[PDB]
């Protein structure tokens, strides 16, 4: 019974792809601000 496998979580077809076209999102705060 050593050949038996367990169903896990589904994966994305192109999971490896897309690192080089990834762009950063910078979190900023406004200097001039009042209500």
């Amino acid at each position: 019974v050593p050949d038996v496998m367990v169903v896990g979580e589904p994966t994305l077809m192109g999971g490896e792809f897309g690192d080089e076209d990834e762009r950063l999102i910078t979190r900023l705060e406004n200097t001039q601000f009042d209500a």
């Binding site: 038996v4 979580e9 994966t11 994305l12 077809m13 897309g18 705060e29």
Partner: protein
């Protein structure tokens, strides 16, 4: 001094804003061009290629490599979810017992004969009837 949003063309007067693709954005204006989902939160990555700002899903749709299904012999699109058994890949709907046609869930036990997924329950009669 004042900064312009690259998605609505209006001046940013809010407390918190973003900086992406050499531009400034209102927290809500930085969205995918195809689906419209906001990219700033939910650990959602930003992708840029040929003028389009895209989410991971819509980037793979437009630029990802396609695979072949072991069950239906039909192409699987790069954005589609799959079940991977060794070097074989299946569409989510094609990942079922070749005997009983039962769809599988996390924790279920099975065997792989050729490209035929057979559940634990059905191994005995499959082996007698096929080897």
């Amino acid at each position: 001094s004042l900064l312009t949003c690259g998605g609505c063309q209006q001046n940013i007067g809010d407390r918190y804003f973003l900086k992406a693709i050499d531009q400034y954005w209102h927290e809500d204006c930085l969205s995918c061009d195809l689906c419209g989902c906001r990219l700033g939160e939910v650990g959602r990555r930003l992708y840029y290629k040929l003028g389009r700002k895209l989410c991971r899903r819509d980037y793979l749709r437009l630029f990802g490599q396609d695979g072949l299904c072991a069950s239906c012999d039909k192409r699987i699109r790069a954005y589609e979810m799959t079940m991977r058994v060794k070097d074989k890949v299946y569409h989510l709907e094609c990942f079922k017992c070749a005997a009983c046609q039962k769809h599988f869930c996390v924790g279920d036990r099975y065997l792989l004969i050729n490209s035929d997924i057979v559940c634990e329950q059905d191994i005995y009669e499959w082996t007698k009837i096929n080897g």
